Design a protein around this ligand. Structure first.
Ligand SMILES: CNC(=O)c1cccc(-c2ccc3c(c2)N(C(=O)c2ccco2)C[C@H](C)N3C(C)=O)c1
Length: 126
């Protein structure tokens, strides 16, 4: 069972805009979560071949990771801030869906989600 390709991260046909909200998502939210001690498993797609998890992509049909989110922001892939926020939410919930409650990786994602919510609290107005 091969890994799927990573989510798309750049599309020259998508329109581009700079907004206060998207700038904040890259410069504050993503940068803060990226440097966190628990960020490392989330910095690239789950490599289920390397990890011998043949049911990962049978269970998780909407993968997402922070490496993808970073690339999407840098490539002006998102038009609405909510698209980015949804991707963060998908990342965290994928981790809760697949892994056992109480596992280290779950507590890691929970800490990262709490930080994310503290950072999103101060998102600029639309
Ligand atoms: C560059 N490679 C890595 O950063 C890397 C190396 C070894 C393992 C991992 C890793 C990546 C993703 C995950 C886990 C481990 N997982 C772990 O259980 C785990 C335990 C402790 C840290 O990660 C399995 C699970 C599928 N998972 C997530 C994000 O849900 C990532």
């Amino acid at each position: 069972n091969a890994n799927p390709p990573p989510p798309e991260t750049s599309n020259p046909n998508k329109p581009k805009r700079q907004t206060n909200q998207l700038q904040y998502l890259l410069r504050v939210v993503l940068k803060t979560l990226w440097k966190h001690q628990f960020a490392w498993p989330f910095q690239q797609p789950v490599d289920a071949v390397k990890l011998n998890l043949p049911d990962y992509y049978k269970i998780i049909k909407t993968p997402m990771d922070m490496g993808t989110i970073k690339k999407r922001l840098e490539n002006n892939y998102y038009w609405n801030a909510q698209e980015c926020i949804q991707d963060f939410n998908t990342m965290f919930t994928n981790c809760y869906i697949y892994n056992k409650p109480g596992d280290d990786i779950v507590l890691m994602a929970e800490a990262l989600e709490k930080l994310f919510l503290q950072k999103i609290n101060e998102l600029p107005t639309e």
